[PDB]
Amino acid sequence: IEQPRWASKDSAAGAASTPDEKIVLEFMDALTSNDAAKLIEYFAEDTMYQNMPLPPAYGRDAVEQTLAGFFTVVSVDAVETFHIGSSNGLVYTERVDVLRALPTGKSYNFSILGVFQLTEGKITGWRDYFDLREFEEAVDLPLRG
Amino acid sequence: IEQPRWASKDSAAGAASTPDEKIVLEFMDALTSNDAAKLIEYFAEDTMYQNMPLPPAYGRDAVEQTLAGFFTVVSVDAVETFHIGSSNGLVYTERVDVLRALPTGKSYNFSILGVFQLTEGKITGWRDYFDLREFEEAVDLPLR
Ligand SMILES: O[C@@H]1CCCC[C@H]1O
Ligand SMILES: O[C@@H]1CCCC[C@H]1O
């Protein structure tokens, strides 16, 4: 994974400089764990997670069940964050995630722009925006949308 | 339309509070014009535009040609920005675009997070992120 031409240094991952910005980058690092039990600790009881525009998960239980299900069929091999930034309580991450389908071994790069809302240091919202054309095939589970 | 549960007032459109934020919002209003000649004026000369992960357009010529082509087959009927905000020189719009295919009259809602980089008030980068599953059907152009 190369740095893209449009990558700007003023917003690079290495220059995170709010606590919310730093917690999110930690969370990006933990994605490769493929471990919902570990990942769920970042969330508040009042929280949400959505791969747009698939049906969102609301509540920590739903998020955990959703993440646990994903890791049954796909591995997060790599996460490259190009930009981190934040504004009006929201944090933004422009990045690429590399995903590998466990049953096939096929890998997939997904260009992603994610938004996270934090309250007292814990995720109360996480929405990822990307192309789901290959996501159906990458994730051997029905999308629900 | 909409107003999602996750919509924060703290980051709403009406609360845009920098010149760049003000500009991207005006650019967002302008999209419904479907007029590539009017839109290209927001763009700097050294610039790019991409619907991820389709082949990007680099330079003002390519960008205008790309928008003009899009407006040949599709209308932008509505743009609804729920969040705008900025950080480290970039602007972010969390929004919905309604696109109507001209040959069919079929309409489409796209959930979108876009990043903008402006220079001296001019667009030097614009990348929209969203599901392209219906994009192919909605836009009667070949995908590259
Ligand atoms: O982004 C990925 C989607 C599928 C697996 C878990 C999640 O982190
Ligand atoms: O296809 C639509 C038309 C307007 C701008 C590009 C894209 O969002």
Atom of ligand 1 nearest to the CA of A97: 1
Spell A57-85 as b/e; 16+ CB within 10 A means b.
bbebeebbebbeebbeebbbeebbbbbbb
DSSP per residue over B7-45, as a string?
--GGG-GGG--SHHHHHHHHHHHHGGG--HHHHGGGB-S
* Alpha-carbon span A86 to B10, nearest angstrom: 13
Give the 3-state secondary structure of residue B125. strand
Exposure of B104 by Cβ count < 10 A (0-12 exposed, 13-18 middle, 19+ buried)? exposed
Regarding the beta carbon of A129 and ligand 1, being less than 6 Å apart is answered no
- CATH of residue B76's domain is 3.10.450.50
Active site (annotated) includes residue A128: yes
Nearest to B97 by CA among B31, B49, B22, B141: B31
Q: What is the resolution of this structure in A?
A: 2.2
CA distances from B7 to A9, A95, B12 (A): 29, 23, 8
Give the 3-state secondary structure of residue B99. strand
Minimal C-alpha gap between A36 and chain B (Å): 23
Active site (annotated) includes residue B97: yes
Residues in chain A: 145
Q: Domain tally for chain B?
A: 1
Regarding the beta carbon of B139 and ligand 2, being less than 6 Å apart is answered yes
Give the 3-state secondary structure of residue A1. coil
Question: Chain B within 8 Å of A97 (Cβ-Cβ)?
Answer: no
Helices (H), chain B: 19-30, 36-39, 60-73, 135-138
Contact B128, B112 (CB under 8 A): yes
Nearest to B87 by CA among B108, B61, B115: B115
**Cβ contact, residue pair A90, B129, below 8 Å:** no
Nearest to B63 by CA among B49, B77, B81: B49
Question: Chain A within 8 Å of B133 (Cβ-Cβ)?
Answer: yes
Nearest CA to ligand 2 atom 5: B67
* Alpha-carbon span A123 to A24, nearest angstrom: 9
Exposure of A113 by Cβ count < 10 A (0-12 exposed, 13-18 middle, 19+ buried)? buried
DSSP for residue A59? S
Phi, psi of B32 (to 5 degrees): -70, -5
Question: Chain A within 8 Å of B142 (Cβ-Cβ)?
Answer: no
Nearest to A57 by CA among A123, A109, A1, A12: A123
Could you tell me the residue range of the domain that residue A40 belongs to? 1-145
Phi, psi of A121 (to 5 degrees): 90, 0
Mutate to test the pocket of ligand 1, among A99, A106, A136 (most ligand atoms within 8 A of CB): A99
Minimal C-alpha gap between A66 and chain B (Å): 18
A56's tokens? 């969102």
